[PDB]
Ligand binder design. Sequence first.
Ligand SMILES: Cc1cc2nc3c(=O)[nH]c(=O)nc-3n(C[C@H](O)[C@H](O)[C@H](O)COP(=O)(O)OP(=O)(O)OC[C@H]3O[C@@H](n4cnc5c(N)ncnc54)[C@H](O)[C@@H]3O)c2cc1C
Length: 272
Amino acid sequence: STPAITLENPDIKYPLRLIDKEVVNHDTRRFRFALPSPEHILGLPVGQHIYLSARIDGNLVIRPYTPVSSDDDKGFVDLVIKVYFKDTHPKFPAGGKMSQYLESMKIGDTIEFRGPNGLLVYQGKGKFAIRPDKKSSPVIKTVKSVGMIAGGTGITPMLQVIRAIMKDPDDHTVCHLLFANQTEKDILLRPELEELRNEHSARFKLWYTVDRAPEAWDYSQGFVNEEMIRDHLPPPEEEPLVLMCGPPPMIQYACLPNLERVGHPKERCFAF
Ligand SMILES: Cc1cc2nc3c(=O)[nH]c(=O)nc-3n(C[C@H](O)[C@H](O)[C@H](O)COP(=O)(O)OP(=O)(O)OC[C@H]3O[C@@H](n4cnc5c(N)ncnc54)[C@H](O)[C@@H]3O)c2cc1C
């Protein structure tokens, strides 16, 4: 039999109760929410995400999140969240709306989840189903490798796919991740990524860049660029699928122009 799914209809909002909040570091949290029963699963296909919605200071706010849990987890869903506090970043004095609202929640408070959502679904063994828009059928494409470029919070869509491939010992897809962040301190999910590299190096290639580097730094510094793409994603001759998730200026200025310079078809580079 299969477990009961939580996300039965994508137009329904499901208020889920907050049961645990881990302080991972000063500005990183893991929030665990109970599903409707301990035996439920979320019902989130690999490749897709949920939305959280709430009335925050009187206004509706909706944001996408990819859990760090999977449909293997019974009874809960986990979100890893970067909290963007006010009065930290000079360009963002107000800080972030949903992330500060999550940080404010008390154990036992609920928040609405919806899903699944997203134009890409991973069907296993290299096969991706990608819709051009929501109203259209998917193009099924089967690849031998996947380039992944994440910035900041954009890691969790990548991690979800990486995890799904590595857990299938008969999935020979090779993932190459290039992960950009502001600083070393701001990197999310580093232990988790490095665990995967330790266990699955043949199938999982990991590289970091940081806008500004620490004194002791073994990886790249600067924004994603042509060299990093040549050095840390599969070559275009191999026809990899390229996935991206990061802030709009990163995608627009750093990723697409440089994917094109290397020769990847820019039109086929998918942004979550
Ligand atoms: C498919 C998908 C999955 C995602 N999964 C996750 C996830 O698992 N975890 C997660 O944390 N986010 C995730 N995100 C990002 C998430 O949707 C929100 O963008 C994020 O929570 C910030 O929203 P907010 O309402 O707090 O900030 P907003 O109010 O929307 O602020 C706008 C932007 O301002 C910038 N900003 C604000 N304050 C600061 C600051 N102090 N320093 C640096 N920049 C700042 C950030 O770039 C921010 O996104 C995902 C996004 C996508 C597209």
